[PDB]
Ligand binder design. Structure first.
Ligand SMILES: Nc1ncnc2c1ncn2[C@@H]1O[C@H](COP(=O)(O)OP(=O)(O)OP(O)(O)=S)[C@@H](O)[C@H]1O
Ligand SMILES: Nc1ncnc2c1ncn2[C@@H]1O[C@H](COP(=O)(O)OP(=O)(O)OP(O)(O)=S)[C@@H](O)[C@H]1O
Ligand SMILES: Nc1ncnc2c1ncn2[C@@H]1O[C@H](COP(=O)(O)OP(=O)(O)OP(O)(O)=S)[C@@H](O)[C@H]1O
Ligand SMILES: Nc1ncnc2c1ncn2[C@@H]1O[C@H](COP(=O)(O)OP(=O)(O)OP(O)(O)=S)[C@@H](O)[C@H]1O
Ligand SMILES: [Mg+2]
Ligand SMILES: [Mg+2]
Ligand SMILES: [Mg+2]
Ligand SMILES: [Mg+2]
Lengths: 550, 550
């Protein structure tokens, strides 16, 4: 119940920050005294809910030799009027007494909402009590104030101003590497069986917080007990120890526990996440591959030539082309190359968060990408922004609405020195306003054509990298016959053909064929159907000839 | 008044959960101690109102040897300021005193609304009192907190976060099997007559909660007394016992009680319910029957071939075709085959719940289907979503509105590993945006043609399975003459012909004839009228030739 550094894992970069911010001024205040700067007393934690934010507090606090004081958000708000503000005054006097001191406040937004958006003056006093007492502190006190929340936007920003809270520290969703470590934290207390592959689990878990993983560990434990319920009689007052020794959680319990309701995660926000697709997994289009190698990889790798040449680059890249051409995966593979952070934002994600009005988060998309620089910001489904008013034809309203007017501010509100990059992608590029296509905003426009038969060969090579295909498969004879078919169409054929294979596989199981026959294919090849009209392409090829007329 | 397990019935799977969650840590805390996990102290009950949620609390609580404490929602809110929060502190100290303890809180939303949507700070204190005192508990306390509500969305979600309430337990509407059991619970105390067939009643009751059934039992009792009111004089101070012995409730009292006012149920929500129609009840269209056997039955039966083949399936199926082609029943019969759970959602059900703004429920549609996985989510009347803005022509607004932008998020917010399935059905498929028809969202598109005369034969065989038809009935001669007539038209003819039969049946009464004559038919056959123009079909057949051009 007392937390060390080993009890938390995965968010190493974040803990590297806090040790510089909290561990460093306390065990060595002389360093800031020798260099002659002020120690930051404004450490702020934030992130998604249930992400160890309370856990990382004591992970730092118990690893000091400093005094610690604890404040809960609702504990002060539970108290009566006046007495609640007394405890804050009782808090800081003890911390300024025991001068090496740590003040952590969990759920800071409950005692500090926006003063504009609040009703009770008792809430307004305790905010005003907090704003007063933060400034009443001293640098000679050597007392560090920590605060955590899950809603960094609901806070009164006067705290987030200078002198009170300056150190915005986000706790992001961990990678499969770091969440593997988190599983090892919870399972090292657990009693498992030898079949348990956490690395298989951590690969199969993608958007989970540690609370989801701890519930995941707690869930598969229960199913292990459910298997033993036949051997366990509940009318007994104590079960025997032999079933306790056999109580070892199987890998299949986690396979059970991956398909249950725990696995509903918290992924419905504006997330930053490193991608997984690469250049080999996208067949063909090597010209625009190198164009991204030109336009976005050269700044993130070498800003030195720019200051050599005195020229800031174009930060605005627009993808366009026919639909179903893998334009979503393109920005993921290039962020996976130069290891930049990645933020996927779709069209209705703007709108559905604006039926709930999350537009500071839209600014925070740029801010977190500024916080996670180098980062690329990917705007999927830009036609949906036009389809917020139906289209450019639409309900007579064009692409421009409150979304565009927000984005044009935030795209122009980006420093050109920043390597934070914005990637736009649509399939209906005529149906977007040129105000967003304005130079400085989005001036690079990249057409994504259909592949040729060599590209369609390279896709079918790349798509079937994980499939047990047959040996007689002439993909080139497929690539000969597939001409007008998109890369989405080719994957759609394989989804048909695998379904045709399962119409042989479990059909034989009810009557292992791990091979995808020509008979599986020539049925789907006869059933093959083109999804893109060539007269639609003649539009895009005229745009590929010239869209700069606009 | 003291409730055992036998006093509740029907929701066996839910009680199987709670015994794992409440009975299991209390009579054997050693199991979680031996396996080394934390016992969940966050049991939350929810469901429709009047569904035994208060009843199942004591059904668990009286079946422990544990201490129990009771909290009512409005009882705390009835109290004065400060004193109300005192009783919560007085609650948990007694439970942490008597350490095997059960804390049930009925109507948790009354003491815990959303802190964003509330006015009194006294409400905000008692929420803050609750959030504090939940975290003040210990695992060594071995104290379980139960809470029930009928509005799971009105709660402050900080309770529903980790450490406070993790175990979301829904109490669904029971099947006719389980509600049969509920009738036997109430009637075993009652004095009935021998004509009483609860199984006939439980078949005839479809969307009732146990409160509706208990009112149903109480209603037919009163009509039984109404029959005895001639033998009962109210000026008497005590009626004789002979009418008490004859006071036995008839089956016809329930036949009276089924048509009364009670039978208004609570069915106006997003419900999950297993269907009843099967493949035999839908004549013809065996091709798209097998297509559903391919596309949706293979994943729900065998995910093993997918991980064999490394390919996630297409989770998005769109039904389309001309109107009145039985497309509503298609998703019901396939959920009845592979025993998956079923959620019927119509078009205006989205809209009418969004004039009252129930969109978390729209997310909870996917969440409850995730809770009731395997489940299929059926979206009836997708043209109505377009008709929210009139159509795609409409009021110049297309299909896209706040509904689509919500659904595109929630459809994309589904894990591909989940067997939770989404089934779309419209009759105006041109009038829907391709953004919803996007691959990953809804890529399987299934045309539903009119049947042939053999299909029209199979329908008239299937529709007349429960009708006392005549013996001279040449359905093929009907099927010869019925050519352009839909399956809805054929049922419409029978509704005419039965009305023509009742224009012979009770006409002969006014002057058993349980046969549907050719004379009943050839009148309706002469009165037969086609509902679908063939030029409308030539649209759909061109879509059936090619809609992939979009
Ligand atoms: N990354 C993680 N590593 C280990 N345990 C974790 C992690 N994330 C969450 N947990 C566990 O889940 C709990 C989440 O509790 P809290 O940190 O209080 O939640 P939070 O992160 O503070 O956000 P709140 O409390 O909902 S505002 C932790 O106390 C741990 O028990
Ligand atoms: N050339 C291609 N190579 C590999 N995969 C492709 C290719 N074209 C399409 N796909 C796949 O088909 C889907 C289309 O990806 P997206 O880029 O999202 O489609 P889009 O071109 O953006 O247009 P929409 O409206 O989103 S379908 C993805 O699952 C891709 O993996
Ligand atoms: N499934 C059921 N089985 C047996 N009796 C039931 C069932 N559902 C409701 N009842 C009866 O109806 C009463 C309604 O009380 P509860 O349903 O427990 O209250 P609730 O479920 O919390 O819903 P509220 O009070 O309207 S929010 C119960 O006390 C039972 O007598
Ligand atoms: N092939 C069929 N087999 C059996 N019943 C059918 C058939 N076609 C239509 N019906 C009946 O016709 C009615 C129409 O059902 P629905 O699915 O609602 O019709 P639809 O095709 O979905 O178009 P609408 O707009 O709902 S009328 C139902 O009562 C069906 O039982
Ligand atoms: Mg917290
Ligand atoms: Mg796309
Ligand atoms: Mg109740
Ligand atoms: Mg219908």
């Amino acid at each position: 119940n007392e937390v060390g550094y080993d009890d938390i894992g995965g968010c190493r970069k974040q803990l590297a920050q806090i040790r510089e911010m909290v561990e460093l001024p306390l065990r060595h205040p002389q360093l800031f005294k020798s260099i002659g700067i002020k120690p930051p007393r404004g450490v702020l934690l934030y992130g998604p809910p249930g992400t160890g934010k309370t856990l990382m507090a004591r992970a730092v606090a118990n690893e000091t030799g400093a005094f610690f004081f604890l404040i809960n958000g609702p504990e002060i708000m539970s108290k009566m009027a006046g007495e609640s503000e007394s405890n804050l005054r009782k808090a800081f006097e003890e911390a300024e007494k025991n001068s090496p001191a740590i003040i952590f406040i969990d759920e800071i937004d409950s005692i500090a909402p926006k003063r504009e958006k609040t009703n009770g003056e008792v809430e307004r006093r305790v905010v005003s009590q907090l704003l007063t007492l933060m400034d009443g502190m001293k640098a000679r006190s050597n007392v560090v104030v920590m605060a955590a929340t899950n809603r960094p936007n609901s806070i009164d920003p006067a705290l987030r101003r200078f002198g009170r809270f300056d150190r915005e520290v986000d706790i992001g969703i961990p990678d499969p590497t770091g969440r593997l470590e988190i599983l090892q934290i919870h399972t090292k207390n657990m009693k498992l069986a030898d079949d348990v592959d956490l690395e298989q689990i951590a690969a199969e878990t993608h958007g989970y917080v540690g609370s989801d993983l701890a519930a995941l560990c707690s869930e598969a434990a229960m199913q292990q007990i459910r298997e033993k319920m036949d051997l366990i009689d509940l009318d007994e007052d104590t079960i025997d120890a032999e079933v306790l020794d056999s109580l070892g959680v199987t890998m299949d319990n986690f396979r059970y526990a991956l398909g249950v309701s725990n696995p509903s995660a918290l992924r419905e926000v504006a997330v930053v996440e490193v991608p997984n697709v690469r250049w080999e997994d996208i067949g063909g289009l090597e010209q625009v591959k190198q164009e991204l190698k030109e336009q976005v990889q050269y700044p993130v790798d070498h800003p030195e030539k720019f200051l050599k040449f005195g020229l800031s680059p174009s930060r605005g890249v627009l993808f366009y082309g026919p639909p179903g051409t893998g334009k979503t995966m393109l920005a993921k593979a290039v962020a996976n190359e130069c290891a930049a952070n990645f933020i996927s934002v779709k069209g209705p994600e703007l709108l559905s968060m604006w039926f709930g009005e999350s537009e500071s988060n839209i600014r925070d998309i740029f801010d977190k990408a500024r916080a996670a620089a180098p980062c690329v910001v990917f705007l999927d489904e830009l036609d949906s922004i036009a389809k917020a008013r139906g289209g450019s034809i639409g309900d007579a309203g064009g692409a421009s609405d409150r979304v565009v007017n927000q984005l044009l501010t935030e795209m122009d509100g980006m420093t050109s020195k920043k390597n934070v990059f914005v990637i736009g992608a649509t399939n209906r590029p005529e149906q977007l306003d040129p105000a967003l296509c304005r130079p400085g905003r989005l001036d690079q426009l990249i057409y994504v054509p259909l592949p040729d038969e060599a590209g369609r060969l390279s896709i079918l090579k790349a798509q079937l990298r994980k499939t047990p295909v047959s040996k007689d498969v002439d993909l080139a004879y497929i690539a000969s016959k597939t001409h007008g078919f998109s890369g989405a169409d080719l994957a759609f054929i394989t989804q048909r053909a695998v379904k045709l294979a399962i119409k042989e596989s479990i059909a034989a199981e009810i009557e292992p064929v791990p091979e995808l026959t020509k008979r599986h294919f020539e049925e789907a090849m006869r059933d093959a159907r083109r999804s893109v009209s060539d007269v639609e392409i003649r539009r895009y090829e005229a745009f590929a000839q010239q869209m700069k007329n606009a």
